[PDB]
């Protein structure tokens, strides 16, 4: 599905971002919500992840 611009593989092929691919801010938000922390916590987090 490298020709499909609505998927992550196609957006990587086109070198773009969106809902399917997402920038690194999406990873930051998801891992802040996963660890039950406020979104104003500075990145990288002042916690040990095990």
């Amino acid at each position: 599905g490298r020709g499909d611009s609505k998927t992550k593989k196609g957006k990587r092929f086109k070198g773009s971002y969106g809902n399917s691919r997402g920038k690194k801010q999406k990873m930051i938000e998801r891992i802040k919500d996963k660890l039950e922390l406020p979104r104003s916590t500075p990145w990288p987090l002042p916690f040990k992840l095990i």
């Binding site: 998801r30 919500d33 996963k34 039950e36 040990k48 992840l49 095990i50």
Partner: protein, 380 residues
């Protein structure tokens, strides 16, 4: 089907001669049959506790752990290893339950460790010992089931998310062993049970609460939750509150796959006409009733690393800082006992057994029990 048949006949011929039940350096491989799980002492460490699979499923009606099932399907024998860590956990909860007539026991314990070290088997053996002593144990061998699958509706009073099918599954799994005991235990909270949204049927028309009868026991409350899909979540919450008020028998909460309650769930909430937001497991009503360890109940929650939970904080929320305990892998002696057991159960040929070979398997697996049991048939 002739492949397994020869090993089955050889194992049936092995049990007639009791001299083949040997371990390392001529030790007896199995515990004596008169010994139960409460009578295990330090001289039984490294030996094997034989079970009966029908009896084991009777004591554990919520389902055997997947590690127990895998080990039983590979060994063709209902037996488990007596380790020092299980005896330490059992002695810890025994000293909590009754003090003997400076190691401070811990009421809340999180069983953490490397993957496939034996956390699920230790938890199941602890539940077997606790139910042998007649304890009110709510055992959840699949804690990932609490957060995955089914329906989810937002509570209009508390703001949490209700899962009715999972709640009724929890209640059925509890009652499946605790039916004789819950009939003899009276409810200590007599507030009415607030009804919620049913599984695909919405609210109940005209009825908002179910009152608690004066003579009702805990079995009546659990059956009220089972029979009505509009009250199962509230009955699970009331059961959590009622388990802290039981004074006749010890109460133990055992949750396997406990780290799934600190990550996201399967469910997502539409917060925007173009967007959805994942719902955390802590927002589920059953989990929010059951996750916290900041109380005085005897609760044990074992983590799992086979599930793709990922990385959590070392300082877990709503957990005491000293609750986490390291469950280790096999040592040299436990690995030697395991390899001699697999020799006894004919997982490996007798002609290709040596100290160097099982030491090679142990050092390759680095104490991983599943990898060790997978590598013994490849021994030459």
């Amino acid at each position: 089907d002739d492949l397994e048949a020869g090993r089955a006949k050889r194992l049936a011929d092995d049990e007639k001669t009791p001299s083949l039940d040997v371990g390392p350096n001529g030790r007896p491989l199995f515990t004596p049959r008169d010994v139960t799980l409460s009578k295990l002492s330090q001289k039984d460490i490294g030996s094997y506790f034989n079970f009966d699979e029908a009896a084991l499923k009777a004591v554990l009606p919520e389902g055997l752990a997947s590690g127990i099932e895998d080990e039983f399907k590979e060994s063709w024998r209902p037996a488990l290893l007596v380790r020092k860590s299980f005896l330490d956990l059992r002695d810890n909860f025994r000293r909590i339950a009754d003090p003997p007539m400076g190691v401070k026991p811990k009421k809340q314990i999180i069983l953490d460790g490397p993957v496939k070290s034996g956390k699920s088997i230790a938890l199941a053996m602890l539940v077997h010992w606790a139910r042998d002593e007649g304890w009110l144990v709510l055992y959840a061998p699949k804690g990932r089931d609490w957060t995955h699958g089914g329906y989810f509706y937002k509570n209009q009073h508390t703001g949490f998310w209700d899962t009715p099918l999972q709640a009724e599954s929890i209640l059925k799994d509890f009652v499946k062993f605790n039916e004789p005991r819950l009939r003899e235990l009276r409810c200590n909270v007599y507030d009415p049970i607030v009804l919620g949204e049913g599984a695909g049927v919405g609210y109940l028309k005209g009825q908002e609460t179910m009152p608690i009868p004066e003579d009702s026991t805990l079995y009546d409350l659990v059956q009220m939750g089972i029979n009505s899909t509009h009250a199962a979540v509230s009955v699970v919450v009331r059961l959590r509150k009622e388990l802290s008020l039981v004074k006749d028998v010890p109460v133990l909460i055992a949750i396997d796959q406990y780290n799934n309650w600190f990550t996201f769930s399967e469910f997502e909430e539409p917060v925007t006409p173009r967007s959805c937001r994942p719902i955390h497991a802590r927002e589920l009503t059953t989990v929010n009733a059951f996750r916290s360890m900041m109380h005085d109940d005897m609760m044990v929650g074992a983590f799992s690393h086979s599930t793709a939970v990922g990385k959590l904080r070392k300082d877990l929320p709503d957990v005491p800082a000293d609750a986490r305990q390291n469950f280790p892998r096999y040592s040299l002696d436990e690995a030697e006992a395991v390899c001699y057991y697999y020799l006894r159960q004919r997982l490996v040929r007798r002609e290709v057994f040596s100290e160097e070979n099982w030491k090679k398997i142990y050092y390759l697996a680095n104490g991983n029990g599943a990898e060790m049991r997978w590598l013994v048939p490849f021994m030459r």
